[PDB]
Each structure stands twice: as structure tokens, then as C-alpha cells.
Design a protein around this nucleic acid. Structure first.
Ligand SMILES: [Zn+2]
Lengths: 216, 128, 94, 93
RNA sequence: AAUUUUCUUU
RNA sequence: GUGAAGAGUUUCUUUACUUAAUCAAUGAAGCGGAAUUGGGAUUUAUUUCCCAUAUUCUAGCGUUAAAGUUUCUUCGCGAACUGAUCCGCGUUGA
RNA sequence: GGAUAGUCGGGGGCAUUCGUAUUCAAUUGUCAGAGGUGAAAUUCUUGGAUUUAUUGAAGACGAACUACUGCGAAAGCAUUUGCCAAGGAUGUUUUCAUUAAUCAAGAACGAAAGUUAGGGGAUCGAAGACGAUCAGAUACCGUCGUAGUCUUAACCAUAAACUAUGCCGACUAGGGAUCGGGCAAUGUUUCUCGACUUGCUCGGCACCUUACGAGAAAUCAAAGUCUUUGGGUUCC
């Protein structure tokens, strides 16, 4: 029996190029020996990190993205986009009484093999002059709102690929377009993508990672 | 940028508190200490004093490696249960803060259900 | 609009042909515009009818439902396999 | 005349073999000796021959179908067909 | 936690 | 039989090979490797890292070769190549 | 009664979509307790318990939004979409013209639990097994746990099935919220409509004050219009 820390090594984690940062943190992997590869045992790791950390701005503190470590390059692991979510505190704060919440979902496909199930949630809003405290929308209007969200998602995601998906989720263009399209219906507020899930993956993009990386 | 960030999970149950500290990833953890190995009375496992003792022991063992900042994540029993963190959650947070180790990104990750299965008790409930 | 209502009003005011032999006769004579083939049709007969309509420049619709359903839509108490609408009347079947 | 309160087709068995066994056989034989519809001809002429073979007569569609012991299609086979259909669509798409 | 019982009347 | 790791001048363990030996199938009927072929990223790109298939049909038929440059000499249902790429230490699989 | 127009509905059925949680399975990381409880105790854990991380399967259920709010004859109905049939209210210088109300006998639906066959059985959990409390615990407490909890095809047919308050019709006091519809605004706002504000009206769910009135009272806009006793009709 010896110290278990003598068989451990520290490696850096590199977020994909879609973000504004390069160094995210350090990981821990056991000593590389025979019949057991650190590369083999590393590719099945999942990281969670804040979008505020990735963008160096507190404008996305509530958003948290997950990364999947895939490739190792010079003792510096490279990760890829695996999904985004919203913090429990933000979700509970957004959920309120005496208002109507509409949540919808849709599955989207990129130019390459990528299946992404993206969700969206939006809440009704007052008009700064309303006297009543109900602020409720009829189920027909909810269905019309869901159709408007479906149309907006399809139109904005018809041909983007993952690069444009990340480039358009940070500025929150999906929620803005949904609110714009919902002008003829209840004004709606706090429309955002609550969670994006990844169902299919390409063939590891073993060469496209080299294409994207290699800069700085 | 000479700081190293880990992930500190806190499981604040009403019977015993878990102070688990891992790296930024999930696997290959470093430290895991609860109140059971800090108090041997089988009653004060969830006590704030035992939680702070486990938290400070975790801090010492983490400083042994040389890790500076931790992303904290507290969580209750969750699921179809009380879903409220125990008294040891705040005690562990204060103990980590007082030990000198940096704290960042506080979040609650208790598992909530979307109307999950039936809770035990038998309709009438635990008539204690 | 649906097609069952259109078929019903063609039945009220239009020219229809029932069966397979008469449908072949209508396609052969060229006084054919639309043929309806039930989903329960024999595959060889369906291919033959499609070839006949392609030769005669007649539209084909292999609508869902069995020949029992086709007969019920046609308003008859017997099974109907092939429908041949020769005159649409006042409809937009064609 | 009704001629039978509840035994029905099992009236040939008289009073023997037990009531529960006779009832189970009655349900099975009712399913077994039933005319079914050919899924290709639309005629109620499908009859069973030798526990799993179903044939319908007529000038056309003399097909012989492989079915259940006393029903043309079983629930398990229908569920399997739906599952295989679903899996094939996922593989193709 | 744990706490059962108070004969027939004046 | 042949080799690679761990270990207190030596062989204990597991972990690789097939020709020993064992099993199964068959009319021992297509096993393995090479050259173009178009995507594919190394990249002011080079097969350098990657492997790709012709028959879905409806209860029909599918055999005894056609077509091609060119050889008698073009009496020929003539002889060869090709159509049917080349090669081989293994009939195939466990 | 029927038709028509815009609507409305957590009303019904079928097909379809999504969500976390629970349990389990495989794999990876350090080690000594983990569960549970007033206290414990049973049980399993240096053979790796518990936790953390990845993937998958099973079944159940649709949290928050969710309300003195909606729908249905009631029992009941709460994830997305599509389809089908149907329904109330509203609008109407549309149609028929008494077609109406309440019912014996007779019929449809009828929570949960219970039964017969098929599938499925995650969680909880009758019976039961142990372990603590007590003088005795056979129970309340902890873990496990069969039927059951899910569903299909046949059954039955009752609950504090309640609003402990039958159905239809007329009249009766002041006000403010809420749902659905309609009317009106030289009203507001957002790149012809929606949202918001105000007033009026119809039909519901209810609420506050009061008692001309009722009751034995609690209380009741009906349980009032009953010794000043009679609108009609069933059950008891
Ligand atoms: Zn047939």
C-alpha cells in the first residue's frame, strides 16, 4: 500500500473554438501503464462548466454547458459541445404563480450527422398598466404560441450546423424571434432554450477537430 | 491564472452529510469524507459540527494535493423525498470558506421528480 | 377538401364505372380521366391498371383502405376493386 | 331456440372433463372454427387447417398463411411486427 | 419515545 | 509446440500464435492481399492518416454466350485473349 | 327542438411525442462505514458498501405553472401533436310550431377495492417474515415482502358516490372579484390583429355585508316568497 496520488497526472482541458476561452480547467487520470490506456479511460468523461466562464461575461451566468472530452493532443485534452441547460435557481426564479408557462420541444438536424432535441420555455407578461393579477392565456392561444415557436425554430435551424447553433444560442436569437413572432398573440416573456440534448454523434470528427484546432 | 478548480459535491441528508470532492471532471475523485467518520455517536452524523469537521478534513486533504478553488454543488436527498438540504449543508459551506479554500459557482443540484412514483407511508402516512 | 365528399357528389352528378372489366374497357376506349385503386388490390392487377392508365394518359390514385372501404365510400353494399371516373361532373376529382 | 345456455360448442362434450376446462376449450374452439378475412382478397373465407395454417378459397388469392394455433394473428406477433417496423424505419432513416 | 385502571350511593 | 509482460544462475501467474489436437458446414463455390475508381483532409495538398459493392419483384424467365481488338485467310456456330483484373503457404468458420 | 358564424373546454376515444424521478444492470476513482431512527435496532460493507462519473433497460406518473379557476349527467378529466364523433354558452329580422316538465316498469355509465383468462410487473404495498418500544404489542416505528397497484377481453354496481341540500318554472338587496361569449371606445400599447383599461349584457363557479324573510339554532339569496299554510312532478 502506497500513496494513491503517485499514480495520477494532471492534464489541461480545451473547450471547443466556439467559446471565448481556451483553458477551462484541469482533469485527473490514473498512471498510464500496460493493458490500460489513459486515452482509453479518458474519452468517457463529461464536464459541466458555466457559459459565463466560457464567454468571460456574466450575461450568461444562468446558462451552463456540458462538454465531452474526445481527443488528446500533447497532454492537453480537447472537448466538444455536448449540450446546454439552465441552473435550477434560475428556473425556479422564472417559474411564478398567476402566469402561464408554455414549454415546447423540437428535434433538429445539422449539415452533418447530429440530432439535437432543443427545448424552449416562455412565460406570460404584464403590460405595465394591467390592473388584474391573473394574466392567463387560453389553451388555443397556447397552441398558437407553440406553433409559432415550432415555426421559428425550424426557420432559424433549417441549415446552421453546430457552429452556427452555438453562435446563435449565446445571443439568444431563438427567444427573440419567438417573442417577435408572438406579437399577434400574448406578448410572452423570458423565452429561452432551457435544455438542448444530443442524441447522435459523428465519427468522432478525428480530422475535423484538427481542422478547427491548431490555432494559438 | 495559477488556480486549480475542483468540484465539491455536498449531499445534505437529514441523517448524514456527505462531503465529496472530485476534480473538474466527474471520475477520478480525490476526497470523500462524511460525518460518520468524524463522530462515532450514530446520532450526530447530520449535526453541523460533524459536517464542519468533515468539511475541514476534506479541505486539509485537498490542500495536501494543492488544489485552490472548488466549484461547490449542494444537493438534498431529492427524488420523492424531503428535497430540503439538511443543517450540515451551510456548516460545510462555512467550513470550506473558513479553511481558506476558494469557493465558486454555488448551485443546487438536488434531483427533482416530474411526478415520480408513489412515496412510502401508505396513504395515512408515517403515524409516528 | 377531402375526397370522400368529392366522390359522393360525383356519384350524385357524374359518370362512374364499377369493377375491373368495365374499368379496362373505359381505359381502352380512352374516355377515362381518373382511376381509383383500392389498397387490397392484387399487385399484378394494380401494375396492369397503372400500365393501362400510363398508355391512355389517365391519372391514378391508389387510395388507402380495402375494397370494402372503397365500396362503402362509393355507396354500394358490395366490394369495389377499381373505380373509373369518366366524367367528374361539377367536381375537382381530376 | 337457444338450445344451450352457456356451453355452446362444448355441448358435444356432455358433462365430463370439468366446467373450467370445457369453458377454456369452448373459447379456443370458437376462435379456431371461425371464418377470417383474407388481408389480400377482402373476403371472409379464411379457415384453419392443421394448427397454424390458414387458407381462403376462391378463383383468386389461394394463398396459405402462417398464423397462430387458432387465430390468424396473435397479439405478440402484432407487437413484434410493430417493433420490427419501428426498428426498420429508424435504421433506414 | 412512554403514560392501562378508577365498583355500585348519601 | 512457439513467444510477451508481472517476480521473490533459475520458472509461478496471465497473455499472444497456430501447425499439434478438438468441433461444425459444404458439390471442401468465391479466403487473404495488390492497380486504377468518387467522395474523403493531411493542405499555396501526396491515397499520408480513412473504404468503399451490381439483384426488393408483382407467386414470370434466367443453362448449352453474345459483343469486342486479330489470326489462319474470313470453307467456319474455326483455334486463342477478353468478356470473367492479377497474385497466393491455408476449403471455410469457431 | 333544429340549423348557422366566431369561439371555448385539464369533456370522450384512437394514434403519436416529450420530461425528470425510482429501481436495476455494466464499467471507472479514493476509502469505512452506509441505511434508518426520539434513541436505536435488523441488513450489507477493504471481496469495495455509500458517493461520484458514463451508458442502457423496465414500469409507473405528468411536479413546479395549479388558482375559493375550467369541462363532463355523475363517477371523473392535467405532457406535445394529429384525426374522429359530440357538447355548453354567446350572436342571429334563420328554421319547426307546442313538439313540453317529472317519472313506475325497463335500460346506459358508474371511483376505489374485489373476480375469471392474456401480457407486464419499476415504486408502493393487504397477508407474512424478522428488528426495536411496552408488563403483555398480536399494531402504530425500520427493512424486505405475495396478492394488489398497470393493461386487454369478460364480471359486479357500492363510498362521508356530499353541496349530508332531487328536477323544471316565476319573483325578491347592495357591492366587488373570476371564467366563456357578445356590444361600445374620433381609449393605451406592439413589428389590423393581439394584449391591457372602462362601461353594459347573457350563462356558469363562487365571495363580502345585511336580514324585508326563514329556522330549534348552527345558519340560509335559498334552507326566502308557509297558521297570511295550494306553480308542477318523482324518491323517502
Ligand atoms: Zn383471399
Amino acid at each position: 500500500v502506497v500513496d494513491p496520488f503517485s499514480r495520477k497526472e494532471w492534464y489541461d482541458i480545451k473547450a471547443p473554438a466556439f467559446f471565448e476561452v481556451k483553458n477551462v480547467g484541469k482533469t485527473l487520470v490514473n498512471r498510464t501503464a500496460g493493458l490500460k490506456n489513459a486515452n482509453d479511460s479518458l474519452k468517457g468523461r463529461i464536464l459541466e462548466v458555466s457559459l459565463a466562464d466560457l464567454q468571460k461575461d456574466e450575461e450568461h451566468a444562468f446558462r451552463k454547458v456540458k462538454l465531452r472530452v474526445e481527443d488528446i493532443q500533447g497532454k492537453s485534452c480537447l472537448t466538444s459541445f455536448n449540450g446546454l441547460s439552465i441552473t435550477s435557481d434560475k428556473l425556479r426564479s422564472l417559474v411564478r404563480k398567476w402566469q402561464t408557462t408554455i414549454e415546447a420541444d423540437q428535434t433538429i438536424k445539422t449539415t452533418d450527422g447530429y440530432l439535437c432535441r432543443v427545448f424552449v420555455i416562455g412565460f406570460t407578461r404584464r403590460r405595465a398598466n394591467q390592473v388584474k393579477k391573473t394574466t392567463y392565456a387560453q389553451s388555443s392561444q397556447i397552441r398558437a404560441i407553440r406553433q409559432k415557436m415550432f415555426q421559428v425554430i425550424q426557420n432559424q435551424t433549417s441549415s446552421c450546423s453546430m457552429r452556427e447553433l452555438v453562435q446563435k444560442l449565446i445571443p439568444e436569437v431563438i427567444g427573440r424571434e419567438i417573442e417577435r413572432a408572438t406579437g399577434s398573440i400574448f406578448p410572452l416573456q423570458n423565452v429561452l432554450v432551457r435544455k438542448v440534448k444530443i442524441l447522435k454523434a459523428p465519427k468522432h470528427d478525428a480530422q475535423k477537430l484538427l481542422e478547427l484546432h491548431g490555432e494559438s | 491564472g495559477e488556480l486549480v478548480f475542483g468540484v465539491a459535491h455536498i449531499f445534505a441528508s437529514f441523517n448524514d452529510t456527505f462531503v465529496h470532492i472530485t476534480d473538474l471532471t466527474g471520475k477520478e475523485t480525490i476526497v470523500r469524507v462524511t460525518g460518520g467518520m468524524k463522530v462515532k455517536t450514530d446520532r450526530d452524523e447530520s449535526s453541523p459540527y460533524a459536517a464542519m469537521l468533515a468539511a475541514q478534513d476534506a479541505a486539509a486533504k485537498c490542500k495536501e494535493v494543492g488544489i485552490t478553488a472548488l466549484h461547490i454543488k449542494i444537493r438534498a436527498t431529492g427524488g420523492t423525498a424531503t428535497k430540503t438540504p439538511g443543517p450540515g449543508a451551510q456548516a460545510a459551506l462555512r467550513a470550506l470558506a473558513r479553511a481558506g479554500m476558494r469557493i465558486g459557482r454555488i448551485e443546487d443540484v438536488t434531483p427533482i421528480p416530474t411526478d415520480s412514483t408513489r412515496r412510502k407511508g401508505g396513504r395515512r402516512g408515517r403515524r409516528l | 377538401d377531402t375526397i370522400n365528399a368529392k366522390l359522393a357528389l360525383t356519384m350524385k352528378s357524374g359518370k362512374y364505372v364499377l369493377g375491373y372489366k368495365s374499368t379496362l374497357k373505359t381505359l381502352r376506349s380512352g374516355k377515362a380521366k381518373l382511376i381509383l385503386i383500392a389498397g387490397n388490390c392484387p399487385p399484378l392487377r394494380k401494375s396492369e391498371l397503372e400500365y393501362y392508365a400510363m398508355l391512355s394518359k389517365a391519372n391514378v390514385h391508389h387510395y388507402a383502405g380495402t375494397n370494402i372501404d372503397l365500396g362503402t365510400a362509393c355507396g354500394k353494399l358490395f366490394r369495389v376493386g377499381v373505380l373509373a371516373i369518366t366524367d367528374a361532373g361539377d367536381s375537382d376529382i381530376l | 331456440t337457444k338450445r344451450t345456455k352457456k356451453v355452446g360448442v362444448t355441448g358435444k362434450y356432455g358433462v365430463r372433463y370439468g366446467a373450467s376446462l370445457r369453458r377454456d376449450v369452448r373459447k379456443i374452439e370458437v376462435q379456431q372454427h371461425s371464418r377470417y378475412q383474407c388481408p389480400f382478397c377482402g373476403r371472409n373465407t379464411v379457415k384453419r387447417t392443421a394448427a397454424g395454417i390458414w387458407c381462403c378459397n376462391g378463383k383468386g388469392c389461394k394463398k396459405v398463411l402462417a398464423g397462430g394455433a387458432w387465430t390468424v394473428t396473435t397479439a405478440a406477433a402484432t407487437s413484434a411486427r410493430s417493433t420490427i417496423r419501428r426498428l426498420r424505419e429508424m435504421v433506414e432513416v
